[PDB]
């Protein structure tokens, strides 16, 4: 949760390097988690194979996060609108393009751009409007 706090504390559209670094860290953590689960469920033949798979997944995820944060903060600076979800959408589509590039497939890239950008814009809208993915029981 500390990584999420680091990403949130940086004001949107400011200190683009730090925002990109925090997004890179978040992507790295998610990639490591996915790598651990993949290693468990689908066993690697060798320890070197496991390291290669872990590095591949983690670098893919870290690149996705870094591009998303970098592009989003840059767009927020240039457009000078900090709260617009379109910046997050651009970041998400860029991350999807990076996913396609790492997967070396165009269709993966386009689908990832579309879906990931929509999800990123949704996340920004949730930040703005106070949407709760998990709501404390208030009934």
């Amino acid at each position: 949760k500390t990584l999420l706090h680091k990403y949130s504390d940086i004001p949107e559209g400011t200190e683009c390097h730090r925002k990109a670094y925090a997004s890179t860290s978040i992507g790295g953590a998610t990639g490591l988690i996915v790598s651990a689960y993949s290693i468990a469920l689908k066993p690697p033949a060798s320890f070197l194979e496991g390291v290669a798979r872990t590095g591949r997944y983690t670098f893919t995820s870290a690149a996705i996060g870094a591009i998303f944060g970098l592009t989003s903060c840059i767009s927020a600076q240039v457009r000078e609108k900090p709260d617009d979800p379109l910046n997050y959408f651009i970041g998400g589509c860029a991350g999807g393009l990076t996913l396609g590039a790492r997967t070396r497939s165009y269709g993966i890239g386009a689908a990832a751009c579309a879906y990931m950008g929509l999800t990123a814009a949704l996340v920004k809208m949730g930040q703005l409007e106070g949407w709760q993915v998990f709501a404390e029981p208030k009934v």
Binding site: G126, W131, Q132, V133, F134, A135, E136, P137, K138, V139
Partner: protein, 347 residues
């Protein structure tokens, strides 16, 4: 297995669950779980096959780990509070450990991997007992400790269970595995409302129990464990496959069938608590369950698959054994929607 011994083992399973749902002391609740496991294991192996033994071993290992984690959580809560009573749990680490243990007992993902395998290994009747009765005790325990439950962990497990139950079922042509994945998804649905309103969890559990009882009894009556063996049923007992189609549509949650009301009330309670994204995702993800239900229906009743010449022999004979509660279970599983406001009785 001698029928007296079988009855004693079944009564021991039910007595373990009753002890779980009746005792106010944590040690006795864990004892009830231990009795449930001890009695259940031979019941799973009533018909002796290598698959039955493998399923029993997997189930024993999983439930043993769950019980050990549960007892550690109880011990930690004792250490930090000195209370044995089932109540608010006073240590967050104990709460998390207990939640993981109870989720593993319920088959909630990511502790779901054993449910499909065990269900496939055991017979249809043992599968019915496993997927209907065994769910009662852990759900009761969670309902009693609902307030202490961290909503984030329970909700994440519920959403993952729904997703995985929907995904796994699409790939399955074995009826028992399909039922297991459906059970996983419905368990996710039930545990979603646990932090918010427990009566909704009880209502969903009752509806799910009726639907699964009906489906398993229909499968037993048709003696089918694979999609094709069920496809052959239209030639022999068309009424059975028609009722199977109706029950499948109910399980999918289609209105106006009874399967709609638990989803409807769960969405209502979640929205009242400002949860909007989560109910939306759960409802959309239920479409995968609906899809493989529909594929099973296409295979079984809506479309007439080829039969075999030897079926003419089975035409002459009639079914010897009658399951008395099957008609009422079908009616409750399909036509109880006009009667939801009676959800204040279990309340």
């Amino acid at each position: 297995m001698n029928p007296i011994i079988y009855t004693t083992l079944i009564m021991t399973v039910m007595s373990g669950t009753m002890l779980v749902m009746i005792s106010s002391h944590w040690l006795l609740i864990w004892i009830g779980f231990e009795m449930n496991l001890l009695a259940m294991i031979p019941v799973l192996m009533k018909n002796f096959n290598p698959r039955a033994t493998e399923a029993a071993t997997k189930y024993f290992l999983t439930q043993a780990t769950a019980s050990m984690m549960l007892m550690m959580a109880i011990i930690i809560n004792l250490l930090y509070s000195g209370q044995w009573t089932i109540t608010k749990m006073f240590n967050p680490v104990a709460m998390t450990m207990m939640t993981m243990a109870l989720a593993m007992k319920l088959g909630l993902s990511p502790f779901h991997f054993w449910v499909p395998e065990v269900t496939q290994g055991i017979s249809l009747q043992a599968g019915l007992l496993l997927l209907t009765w065994q769910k009662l005790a852990p759900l009761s325990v969670l309902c009693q400790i609902s307030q202490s439950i961290n909503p984030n962990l329970m909700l994440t497990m519920a959403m993952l269970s729904i997703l995985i139950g929907g995904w796994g079922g699409l790939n399955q042509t074995q009826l028992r595995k399909i039922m297991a994945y459906s059970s996983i998804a419905h368990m996710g649905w039930m545990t979603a409302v646990l932090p918010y309103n427990t009566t909704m969890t009880i209502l969903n559990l009752l509806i799910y129990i009726t639907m699964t009882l009906a489906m398993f009894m229909l499968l037993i009556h048709s003696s089918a464990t694979t999609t094709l063996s069920l496809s052959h049923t239209w030639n022999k007992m068309p009424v059975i496959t028609s009722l199977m189609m109706v029950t499948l549509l109910s399980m999918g949650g289609l209105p106006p069938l009874s399967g709609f009301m638990p989803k409807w009330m769960i969405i209502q309670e979640m929205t009242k608590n400002e949860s909007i994204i989560m109910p939306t995702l759960m409802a959309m993800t239920a479409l995968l369950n609906l899809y493989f239900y529909m594929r099973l229906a296409y295979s079984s009743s809506l479309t007439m698959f080829p039969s075999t010449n030897n079926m003419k022999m089975k035409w002459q004979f009639e079914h010897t054994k009658q399951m008395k509660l099957l008609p009422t279970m079908i009616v409750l599983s399909t036509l109880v929607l006009p009667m939801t406001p009676a959800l204040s009785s279990l309340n």
